[PDB]
mmCIF file of C-alpha atoms in Angstrom:
data_model
loop_
_atom_site.group_PDB
_atom_site.id
_atom_site.type_symbol
_atom_site.label_atom_id
_atom_site.label_comp_id
_atom_site.label_asym_id
_atom_site.label_seq_id
_atom_site.Cartn_x
_atom_site.Cartn_y
_atom_site.Cartn_z
ATOM 1 C CA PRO A 1 -15.488 -1.407 -16.451
ATOM 2 C CA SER A 2 -14.331 -3.955 -14.313
ATOM 3 C CA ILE A 3 -10.827 -5.902 -14.856
ATOM 4 C CA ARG A 4 -10.177 -9.670 -14.299
ATOM 5 C CA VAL A 5 -6.577 -11.022 -14.655
ATOM 6 C CA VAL A 6 -6.112 -14.699 -14.604
ATOM 7 C CA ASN A 7 -2.793 -16.531 -14.367
ATOM 8 C CA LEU A 8 -1.226 -13.323 -15.528
ATOM 9 C CA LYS A 9 2.851 -13.759 -16.469
ATOM 10 C CA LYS A 10 5.517 -11.705 -18.128
ATOM 11 C CA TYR A 11 9.145 -12.896 -18.459
ATOM 12 C CA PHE A 12 11.944 -10.919 -19.509
ATOM 13 C CA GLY A 13 14.412 -13.936 -20.714
ATOM 14 C CA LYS A 14 15.123 -15.559 -17.323
ATOM 15 C CA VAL A 15 13.668 -13.150 -15.133
ATOM 16 C CA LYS A 16 10.276 -13.855 -13.780
ATOM 17 C CA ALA A 17 8.569 -11.010 -13.143
ATOM 18 C CA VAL A 18 5.239 -11.531 -13.295
ATOM 19 C CA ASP A 19 4.995 -15.249 -12.257
ATOM 20 C CA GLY A 20 1.347 -16.264 -12.203
ATOM 21 C CA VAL A 21 -1.375 -13.795 -10.725
ATOM 22 C CA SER A 22 -5.203 -13.451 -10.627
ATOM 23 C CA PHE A 23 -7.106 -11.166 -9.452
ATOM 24 C CA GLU A 24 -10.407 -8.935 -9.832
ATOM 25 C CA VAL A 25 -11.404 -5.396 -9.653
ATOM 26 C CA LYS A 26 -14.973 -4.168 -9.315
ATOM 27 C CA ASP A 27 -16.157 -1.492 -11.985
ATOM 28 C CA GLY A 28 -15.596 1.696 -9.802
ATOM 29 C CA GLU A 29 -13.135 0.181 -7.361
ATOM 30 C CA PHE A 30 -9.789 1.953 -6.474
ATOM 31 C CA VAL A 31 -6.995 -0.974 -6.248
ATOM 32 C CA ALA A 32 -3.303 -0.808 -5.034
ATOM 33 C CA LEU A 33 -0.534 -3.524 -6.048
ATOM 34 C CA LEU A 34 1.669 -2.993 -3.366
ATOM 35 C CA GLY A 35 5.153 -4.627 -2.774
ATOM 36 C CA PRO A 36 8.910 -3.838 -2.585
ATOM 37 C CA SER A 37 11.227 -2.830 -5.782
ATOM 38 C CA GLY A 38 10.822 -5.740 -8.157
ATOM 39 C CA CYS A 39 7.862 -7.516 -6.596
ATOM 40 C CA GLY A 40 6.358 -7.007 -10.524
ATOM 41 C CA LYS A 41 3.872 -4.540 -9.518
ATOM 42 C CA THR A 42 4.776 -1.995 -12.352
ATOM 43 C CA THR A 43 4.736 -5.205 -14.891
ATOM 44 C CA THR A 44 1.735 -5.866 -13.816
ATOM 45 C CA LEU A 45 -0.166 -2.641 -14.010
ATOM 46 C CA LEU A 46 1.686 -1.662 -17.326
ATOM 47 C CA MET A 47 0.279 -5.389 -18.723
ATOM 48 C CA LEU A 48 -3.149 -3.856 -17.560
ATOM 49 C CA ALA A 49 -2.149 -0.921 -19.872
ATOM 50 C CA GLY A 50 -1.275 -2.795 -22.585
ATOM 51 C CA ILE A 51 2.333 -1.519 -23.081
ATOM 52 C CA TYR A 52 3.416 -4.845 -22.094
ATOM 53 C CA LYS A 53 1.975 -8.523 -23.920
ATOM 54 C CA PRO A 54 1.794 -10.785 -21.675
ATOM 55 C CA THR A 55 4.100 -14.114 -21.850
ATOM 56 C CA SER A 56 0.715 -16.057 -20.848
ATOM 57 C CA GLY A 57 -2.195 -15.488 -19.134
ATOM 58 C CA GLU A 58 -5.418 -13.132 -19.798
ATOM 59 C CA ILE A 59 -6.926 -9.532 -19.016
ATOM 60 C CA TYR A 60 -10.311 -9.000 -19.336
ATOM 61 C CA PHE A 61 -11.742 -5.586 -19.055
ATOM 62 C CA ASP A 62 -15.922 -6.499 -18.491
ATOM 63 C CA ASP A 63 -16.417 -9.243 -20.847
ATOM 64 C CA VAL A 64 -14.015 -8.967 -23.165
ATOM 65 C CA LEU A 65 -10.113 -10.241 -23.464
ATOM 66 C CA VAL A 66 -7.979 -7.328 -23.969
ATOM 67 C CA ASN A 67 -4.550 -8.692 -24.371
ATOM 68 C CA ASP A 68 -4.082 -7.769 -27.836
ATOM 69 C CA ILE A 69 -5.949 -4.628 -27.928
ATOM 70 C CA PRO A 70 -3.836 -1.593 -27.775
ATOM 71 C CA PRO A 71 -3.211 1.198 -25.176
ATOM 72 C CA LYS A 72 -5.219 3.407 -26.875
ATOM 73 C CA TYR A 73 -8.544 1.679 -27.556
ATOM 74 C CA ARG A 74 -8.398 0.337 -24.037
ATOM 75 C CA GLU A 75 -9.248 4.050 -22.966
ATOM 76 C CA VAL A 76 -7.124 3.922 -20.372
ATOM 77 C CA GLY A 77 -5.326 6.979 -18.320
ATOM 78 C CA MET A 78 -2.085 6.683 -16.760
ATOM 79 C CA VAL A 79 -0.673 9.000 -14.256
ATOM 80 C CA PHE A 80 2.767 9.350 -13.584
ATOM 81 C CA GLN A 81 5.370 10.196 -10.728
ATOM 82 C CA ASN A 82 6.369 13.445 -12.900
ATOM 83 C CA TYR A 83 3.840 15.982 -13.958
ATOM 84 C CA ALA A 84 5.392 16.424 -16.892
ATOM 85 C CA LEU A 85 3.993 19.882 -17.469
ATOM 86 C CA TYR A 86 5.448 22.794 -20.134
ATOM 87 C CA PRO A 87 6.173 25.824 -17.944
ATOM 88 C CA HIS A 88 6.126 27.788 -21.139
ATOM 89 C CA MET A 89 2.066 27.404 -21.257
ATOM 90 C CA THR A 90 -0.434 27.550 -19.095
ATOM 91 C CA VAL A 91 -2.378 25.758 -16.847
ATOM 92 C CA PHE A 92 -5.287 25.806 -19.586
ATOM 93 C CA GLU A 93 -2.624 25.024 -22.632
ATOM 94 C CA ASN A 94 -1.453 22.363 -19.715
ATOM 95 C CA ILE A 95 -4.797 20.770 -19.751
ATOM 96 C CA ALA A 96 -6.017 21.220 -23.093
ATOM 97 C CA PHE A 97 -3.220 19.649 -24.964
ATOM 98 C CA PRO A 98 -3.862 16.124 -25.758
ATOM 99 C CA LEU A 99 -6.620 18.026 -27.275
ATOM 100 C CA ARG A 100 -4.805 19.180 -29.735
ATOM 101 C CA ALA A 101 -4.962 17.400 -33.372
ATOM 102 C CA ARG A 102 -8.616 16.726 -32.545
ATOM 103 C CA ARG A 103 -11.176 19.414 -33.503
ATOM 104 C CA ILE A 104 -14.612 21.242 -32.385
ATOM 105 C CA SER A 105 -14.015 24.366 -32.540
ATOM 106 C CA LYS A 106 -11.789 27.150 -30.485
ATOM 107 C CA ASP A 107 -13.201 26.364 -27.487
ATOM 108 C CA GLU A 108 -15.639 22.657 -27.125
ATOM 109 C CA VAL A 109 -11.845 22.773 -25.793
ATOM 110 C CA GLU A 110 -11.989 25.050 -22.382
ATOM 111 C CA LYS A 111 -15.682 23.856 -21.440
ATOM 112 C CA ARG A 112 -13.959 20.269 -21.417
ATOM 113 C CA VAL A 113 -11.156 22.133 -19.624
ATOM 114 C CA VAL A 114 -12.722 24.322 -17.280
ATOM 115 C CA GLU A 115 -15.152 21.467 -16.022
ATOM 116 C CA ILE A 116 -12.658 19.232 -15.024
ATOM 117 C CA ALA A 117 -10.660 21.954 -13.719
ATOM 118 C CA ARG A 118 -13.462 22.878 -12.403
ATOM 119 C CA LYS A 119 -14.059 19.159 -10.438
ATOM 120 C CA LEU A 120 -10.391 19.334 -9.376
ATOM 121 C CA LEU A 121 -10.907 22.669 -7.676
ATOM 122 C CA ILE A 122 -8.167 24.697 -10.249
ATOM 123 C CA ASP A 123 -10.472 26.484 -12.391
ATOM 124 C CA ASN A 124 -9.255 29.410 -10.353
ATOM 125 C CA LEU A 125 -6.016 28.689 -11.905
ATOM 126 C CA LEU A 126 -5.885 28.502 -15.571
ATOM 127 C CA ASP A 127 -4.396 31.234 -16.743
ATOM 128 C CA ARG A 128 -1.248 30.846 -14.828
ATOM 129 C CA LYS A 129 1.998 28.474 -15.875
ATOM 130 C CA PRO A 130 3.510 26.044 -13.762
ATOM 131 C CA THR A 131 6.028 27.703 -12.130
ATOM 132 C CA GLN A 132 3.573 29.858 -9.755
ATOM 133 C CA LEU A 133 1.931 27.003 -8.871
ATOM 134 C CA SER A 134 2.600 24.647 -5.400
ATOM 135 C CA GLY A 135 3.281 20.873 -5.613
ATOM 136 C CA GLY A 136 -0.201 20.311 -4.487
ATOM 137 C CA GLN A 137 -1.752 21.988 -7.424
ATOM 138 C CA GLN A 138 0.777 20.766 -10.247
ATOM 139 C CA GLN A 139 -0.361 17.346 -9.304
ATOM 140 C CA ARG A 140 -3.866 18.250 -9.841
ATOM 141 C CA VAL A 141 -3.202 19.584 -13.072
ATOM 142 C CA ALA A 142 -1.202 16.487 -14.041
ATOM 143 C CA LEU A 143 -4.824 14.684 -13.541
ATOM 144 C CA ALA A 144 -7.018 17.076 -14.936
ATOM 145 C CA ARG A 145 -4.900 16.361 -17.877
ATOM 146 C CA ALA A 146 -5.228 12.589 -17.898
ATOM 147 C CA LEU A 147 -9.265 13.163 -16.897
ATOM 148 C CA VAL A 148 -9.579 15.235 -20.166
ATOM 149 C CA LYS A 149 -9.385 12.387 -22.394
ATOM 150 C CA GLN A 150 -12.079 10.735 -20.309
ATOM 151 C CA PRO A 151 -10.422 7.206 -19.676
ATOM 152 C CA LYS A 152 -12.704 4.375 -18.404
ATOM 153 C CA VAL A 153 -9.461 3.095 -16.462
ATOM 154 C CA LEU A 154 -7.063 5.259 -14.535
ATOM 155 C CA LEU A 155 -3.533 3.683 -13.737
ATOM 156 C CA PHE A 156 -1.611 5.306 -11.514
ATOM 157 C CA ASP A 157 1.743 4.188 -11.011
ATOM 158 C CA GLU A 158 3.558 5.656 -7.906
ATOM 159 C CA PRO A 159 2.160 9.538 -8.758
ATOM 160 C CA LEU A 160 2.703 11.029 -5.336
ATOM 161 C CA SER A 161 6.470 9.438 -4.875
ATOM 162 C CA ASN A 162 8.186 13.289 -5.709
ATOM 163 C CA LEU A 163 6.001 15.323 -3.139
ATOM 164 C CA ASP A 164 7.443 16.104 0.272
ATOM 165 C CA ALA A 165 6.469 13.491 2.541
ATOM 166 C CA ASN A 166 4.042 16.295 4.899
ATOM 167 C CA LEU A 167 1.911 16.381 1.538
ATOM 168 C CA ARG A 168 1.824 12.513 0.870
ATOM 169 C CA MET A 169 -0.797 12.433 3.963
ATOM 170 C CA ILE A 170 -3.448 15.316 2.224
ATOM 171 C CA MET A 171 -2.308 14.511 -1.449
ATOM 172 C CA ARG A 172 -3.063 10.820 -0.670
ATOM 173 C CA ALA A 173 -6.960 11.622 0.712
ATOM 174 C CA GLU A 174 -7.490 13.904 -2.384
ATOM 175 C CA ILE A 175 -6.868 11.082 -4.776
ATOM 176 C CA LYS A 176 -9.033 8.539 -2.751
ATOM 177 C CA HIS A 177 -11.965 11.535 -2.678
ATOM 178 C CA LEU A 178 -11.384 12.049 -6.286
ATOM 179 C CA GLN A 179 -11.490 8.517 -7.506
ATOM 180 C CA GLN A 180 -14.665 7.910 -5.345
ATOM 181 C CA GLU A 181 -16.517 10.842 -7.111
ATOM 182 C CA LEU A 182 -15.293 10.363 -10.741
ATOM 183 C CA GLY A 183 -16.357 6.661 -10.315
ATOM 184 C CA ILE A 184 -13.922 5.219 -12.739
ATOM 185 C CA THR A 185 -12.091 1.938 -12.175
ATOM 186 C CA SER A 186 -8.574 2.720 -10.647
ATOM 187 C CA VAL A 187 -5.248 0.352 -10.177
ATOM 188 C CA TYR A 188 -2.551 2.353 -8.043
ATOM 189 C CA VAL A 189 1.283 1.065 -7.650
ATOM 190 C CA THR A 190 3.073 1.857 -4.628
ATOM 191 C CA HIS A 191 5.957 0.400 -2.481
ATOM 192 C CA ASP A 192 4.426 2.644 0.478
ATOM 193 C CA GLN A 193 2.067 0.609 2.823
ATOM 194 C CA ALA A 194 0.462 3.695 4.174
ATOM 195 C CA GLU A 195 -0.326 4.708 0.589
ATOM 196 C CA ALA A 196 -2.313 1.593 -0.237
ATOM 197 C CA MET A 197 -3.768 0.966 3.171
ATOM 198 C CA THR A 198 -5.394 4.473 3.393
ATOM 199 C CA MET A 199 -6.663 4.905 -0.231
ATOM 200 C CA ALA A 200 -7.425 1.689 -1.810
ATOM 201 C CA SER A 201 -10.929 -0.699 -1.461
ATOM 202 C CA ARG A 202 -8.708 -3.753 -2.045
ATOM 203 C CA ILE A 203 -5.274 -4.463 -1.756
ATOM 204 C CA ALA A 204 -3.056 -6.771 -3.791
ATOM 205 C CA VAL A 205 0.559 -7.591 -2.237
ATOM 206 C CA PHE A 206 3.331 -8.748 -4.219
ATOM 207 C CA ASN A 207 6.254 -10.264 -3.693
ATOM 208 C CA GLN A 208 9.002 -12.025 -6.030
ATOM 209 C CA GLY A 209 6.348 -11.877 -8.798
ATOM 210 C CA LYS A 210 3.495 -13.494 -7.141
ATOM 211 C CA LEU A 211 0.359 -12.213 -5.528
ATOM 212 C CA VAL A 212 0.752 -13.328 -2.098
ATOM 213 C CA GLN A 213 -2.775 -11.844 -0.891
ATOM 214 C CA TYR A 214 -5.502 -9.959 -2.167
ATOM 215 C CA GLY A 215 -7.623 -8.288 0.329
ATOM 216 C CA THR A 216 -9.415 -4.977 2.209
ATOM 217 C CA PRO A 217 -6.818 -2.930 4.166
ATOM 218 C CA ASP A 218 -8.629 -4.733 7.596
ATOM 219 C CA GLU A 219 -7.896 -8.312 5.850
ATOM 220 C CA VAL A 220 -4.265 -7.906 4.838
ATOM 221 C CA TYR A 221 -3.781 -6.351 8.365
ATOM 222 C CA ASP A 222 -5.956 -8.354 10.736
ATOM 223 C CA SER A 223 -4.893 -11.686 8.921
ATOM 224 C CA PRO A 224 -1.386 -11.443 7.162
ATOM 225 C CA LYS A 225 -1.160 -14.579 4.805
ATOM 226 C CA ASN A 226 2.515 -14.936 6.093
ATOM 227 C CA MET A 227 5.667 -13.356 7.546
ATOM 228 C CA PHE A 228 6.568 -11.586 4.346
ATOM 229 C CA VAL A 229 2.620 -9.607 4.654
ATOM 230 C CA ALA A 230 3.019 -9.218 8.418
ATOM 231 C CA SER A 231 6.533 -7.203 7.509
ATOM 232 C CA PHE A 232 4.887 -5.473 4.730
ATOM 233 C CA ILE A 233 1.928 -3.685 6.481
ATOM 234 C CA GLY A 234 2.183 -1.176 9.370
ATOM 235 C CA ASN A 235 4.598 1.497 9.879
ATOM 236 C CA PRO A 236 6.261 -0.024 12.068
ATOM 237 C CA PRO A 237 5.187 -3.306 10.592
ATOM 238 C CA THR A 238 5.169 -6.529 12.672
ATOM 239 C CA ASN A 239 8.134 -7.297 15.346
ATOM 240 C CA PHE A 240 9.112 -11.180 15.005
ATOM 241 C CA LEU A 241 10.210 -12.999 17.581
ATOM 242 C CA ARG A 242 11.654 -16.552 16.723
ATOM 243 C CA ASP A 243 12.349 -19.612 18.496
ATOM 244 C CA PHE A 244 9.462 -19.816 21.301
ATOM 245 C CA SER A 245 8.515 -23.451 22.294
ATOM 246 C CA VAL A 246 4.732 -24.537 22.522
ATOM 247 C CA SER A 247 2.845 -26.700 24.928
ATOM 248 C CA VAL A 248 -0.182 -26.803 26.488
ATOM 249 C CA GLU A 249 -0.474 -27.059 30.318
ATOM 250 C CA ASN A 250 -4.123 -27.043 31.821
ATOM 251 C CA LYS A 251 -6.157 -26.612 28.638
ATOM 252 C CA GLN A 252 -3.860 -23.654 27.845
ATOM 253 C CA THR A 253 -1.845 -22.780 25.122
ATOM 254 C CA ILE A 254 1.906 -21.694 26.683
ATOM 255 C CA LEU A 255 4.884 -20.311 24.679
ATOM 256 C CA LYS A 256 8.290 -20.294 25.859
ATOM 257 C CA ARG A 257 11.487 -18.949 25.115
ATOM 258 C CA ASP A 258 14.637 -19.567 27.738
ATOM 259 C CA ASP A 259 13.220 -17.271 30.825
ATOM 260 C CA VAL A 260 10.133 -15.948 29.111
ATOM 261 C CA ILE A 261 7.062 -17.898 29.642
ATOM 262 C CA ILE A 262 3.514 -16.730 27.772
ATOM 263 C CA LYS A 263 0.290 -17.989 28.648
ATOM 264 C CA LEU A 264 -2.256 -17.572 25.975
ATOM 265 C CA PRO A 265 -5.611 -16.343 27.719
ATOM 266 C CA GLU A 266 -7.970 -18.231 25.958
ATOM 267 C CA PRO A 267 -7.716 -21.988 24.173
ATOM 268 C CA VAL A 268 -6.161 -22.046 21.150
ATOM 269 C CA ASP A 269 -5.053 -24.715 18.857
ATOM 270 C CA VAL A 270 -1.367 -24.365 18.256
ATOM 271 C CA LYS A 271 -0.208 -27.640 16.156
ATOM 272 C CA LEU A 272 3.347 -26.847 15.968
ATOM 273 C CA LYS A 273 6.327 -27.510 18.797
ATOM 274 C CA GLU A 274 8.228 -24.318 17.332
ATOM 275 C CA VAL A 275 6.789 -20.683 16.209
ATOM 276 C CA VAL A 276 7.627 -17.524 15.293
ATOM 277 C CA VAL A 277 5.553 -14.969 17.537
ATOM 278 C CA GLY A 278 4.695 -11.652 15.819
ATOM 279 C CA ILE A 279 3.932 -8.310 17.850
ATOM 280 C CA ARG A 280 2.502 -5.423 16.170
ATOM 281 C CA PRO A 281 4.028 -2.451 17.765
ATOM 282 C CA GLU A 282 0.603 -0.608 18.505
ATOM 283 C CA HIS A 283 -0.648 -4.117 19.992
ATOM 284 C CA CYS A 284 2.355 -3.576 22.904
ATOM 285 C CA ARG A 285 2.734 -1.700 26.310
ATOM 286 C CA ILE A 286 5.949 -0.843 28.017
ATOM 287 C CA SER A 287 5.506 -1.992 31.735
ATOM 288 C CA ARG A 288 8.703 -0.393 34.237
ATOM 289 C CA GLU A 289 7.583 -2.939 36.339
ATOM 290 C CA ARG A 290 8.183 -7.059 35.956
ATOM 291 C CA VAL A 291 4.350 -8.243 35.016
ATOM 292 C CA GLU A 292 3.215 -12.021 33.761
ATOM 293 C CA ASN A 293 3.522 -12.940 30.207
ATOM 294 C CA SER A 294 5.579 -10.086 29.175
ATOM 295 C CA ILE A 295 9.281 -10.049 27.648
ATOM 296 C CA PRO A 296 12.213 -8.011 29.518
ATOM 297 C CA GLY A 297 14.564 -5.652 27.704
ATOM 298 C CA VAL A 298 16.095 -2.562 27.693
ATOM 299 C CA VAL A 299 15.114 0.839 26.311
ATOM 300 C CA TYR A 300 17.998 1.096 23.174
ATOM 301 C CA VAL A 301 16.666 4.275 21.279
ATOM 302 C CA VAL A 302 13.922 6.509 21.058
ATOM 303 C CA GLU A 303 13.302 8.020 17.699
ATOM 304 C CA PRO A 304 9.990 10.430 16.089
ATOM 305 C CA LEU A 305 7.596 8.470 13.909
ATOM 306 C CA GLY A 306 5.356 11.537 12.368
ATOM 307 C CA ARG A 307 3.298 12.500 14.935
ATOM 308 C CA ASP A 308 4.223 9.367 17.261
ATOM 309 C CA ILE A 309 7.060 8.328 19.081
ATOM 310 C CA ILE A 310 8.660 4.893 18.512
ATOM 311 C CA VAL A 311 10.347 3.277 21.253
ATOM 312 C CA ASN A 312 12.781 0.615 20.351
ATOM 313 C CA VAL A 313 13.188 -2.316 23.190
ATOM 314 C CA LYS A 314 16.294 -4.410 22.841
ATOM 315 C CA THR A 315 15.311 -8.058 24.225
ATOM 316 C CA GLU A 316 18.283 -10.098 25.572
ATOM 317 C CA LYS A 317 18.203 -12.064 22.241
ATOM 318 C CA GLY A 318 19.862 -9.064 20.565
ATOM 319 C CA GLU A 319 15.966 -8.244 18.807
ATOM 320 C CA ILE A 320 14.857 -4.692 18.335
ATOM 321 C CA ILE A 321 11.538 -4.246 19.439
ATOM 322 C CA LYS A 322 9.452 -1.390 18.325
ATOM 323 C CA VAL A 323 6.206 0.133 20.375
ATOM 324 C CA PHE A 324 4.812 3.515 20.294
ATOM 325 C CA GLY A 325 5.764 5.551 23.273
ATOM 326 C CA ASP A 326 1.919 6.855 24.596
ATOM 327 C CA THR A 327 1.193 8.555 27.734
ATOM 328 C CA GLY A 328 3.743 10.078 30.232
ATOM 329 C CA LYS A 329 6.693 10.831 28.299
ATOM 330 C CA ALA A 330 9.550 9.285 25.967
ATOM 331 C CA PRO A 331 11.829 6.506 28.441
ATOM 332 C CA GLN A 332 15.139 6.783 28.506
ATOM 333 C CA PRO A 333 17.907 4.701 27.039
ATOM 334 C CA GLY A 334 19.290 2.097 29.331
ATOM 335 C CA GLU A 335 15.669 1.984 31.315
ATOM 336 C CA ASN A 336 14.927 -1.922 32.419
ATOM 337 C CA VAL A 337 11.365 -2.225 30.842
ATOM 338 C CA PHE A 338 9.231 -5.348 29.986
ATOM 339 C CA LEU A 339 7.227 -5.604 26.842
ATOM 340 C CA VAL A 340 3.570 -6.487 27.591
ATOM 341 C CA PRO A 341 2.047 -7.658 24.073
ATOM 342 C CA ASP A 342 -1.376 -7.724 24.022
ATOM 343 C CA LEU A 343 -1.860 -11.460 24.015
ATOM 344 C CA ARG A 344 -5.730 -11.406 22.039
ATOM 345 C CA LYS A 345 -3.526 -9.587 19.016
ATOM 346 C CA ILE A 346 -0.280 -11.891 18.947
ATOM 347 C CA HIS A 347 0.648 -13.649 16.012
ATOM 348 C CA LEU A 348 2.147 -17.063 15.697
ATOM 349 C CA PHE A 349 4.032 -17.876 12.539
ATOM 350 C CA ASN A 350 5.288 -21.254 11.281
ATOM 351 C CA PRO A 351 9.258 -21.012 11.116
ATOM 352 C CA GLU A 352 9.452 -23.055 8.092
ATOM 353 C CA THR A 353 7.491 -21.999 5.373
ATOM 354 C CA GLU A 354 6.650 -18.416 7.452
ATOM 355 C CA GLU A 355 2.552 -19.491 6.848
ATOM 356 C CA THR A 356 0.706 -17.307 9.758
ATOM 357 C CA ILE A 357 -0.816 -20.000 12.040
ATOM 358 C CA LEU A 358 -2.579 -17.532 14.558
#
């Protein structure tokens, strides 16, 4: 089914955990609920599950208001951070487990279990027990167990968070491809932007109980609604440089802060006198030589980030500007350099409201 939520709220006494959110999920779509701890994403997921009754607003599955429908009649399958496997049971028995108390022969189960296991590429592990299984394989057993109940909606709550960091890259591609193939509507709670960015069709970005922006990975990345969205998407996220003065000289829009002058290449309409400049790490270059439209700094520290290196550049205003270290090799701490932003990918924000203006 589709899922539509409308002005959804959940209060815990004075705590406005979820304070009026509206979005829709297409039938078969994979949607991530993303934001920091305390943003209300988990409470939202639990309302969709029916584990919390909303304080107000509505939840529809297809045509139907499901607010008052208990979790089992919603046909929701929940996927947790801990696999909750019994190491004294076999993989088969672990997957078959929710099918105890039902009926249909000592092996309609087995057919149902092998069927799901084969889809999940673990049918060759059925007679084994969890201790001899890797983390990736255990994750597949837990998902097989959820899927054997034939849920119509899958609700993931940080299901990769206990997994080692290297494995998370592998396992999120896996869950993405699996969801694609099963075509089951899926909502996925994560505090990790890389996970939302690489898995979801659309991402609902939460902050302090509000839905800030709802869009595709490209949309939330290319067009962040505000400074918060620019700060949360990407690793590293957008670098902010405050206190830039705005003018027009000869049809062109000029940005100034002390000695720093940045002329935007094409005419842009900027209606403020003062802005925050946003520069993404991947849209900025380090020049050892003084060039036009650049920002002076020192190489402060150079660190690994995954397969890449990050060069932290310190500006004369004490900002740390993160940039990817591309060819030659790592500059050295103490080197005087110049930050050359890609002036076409620069963002500008209202310093007061933090709203993105460019």
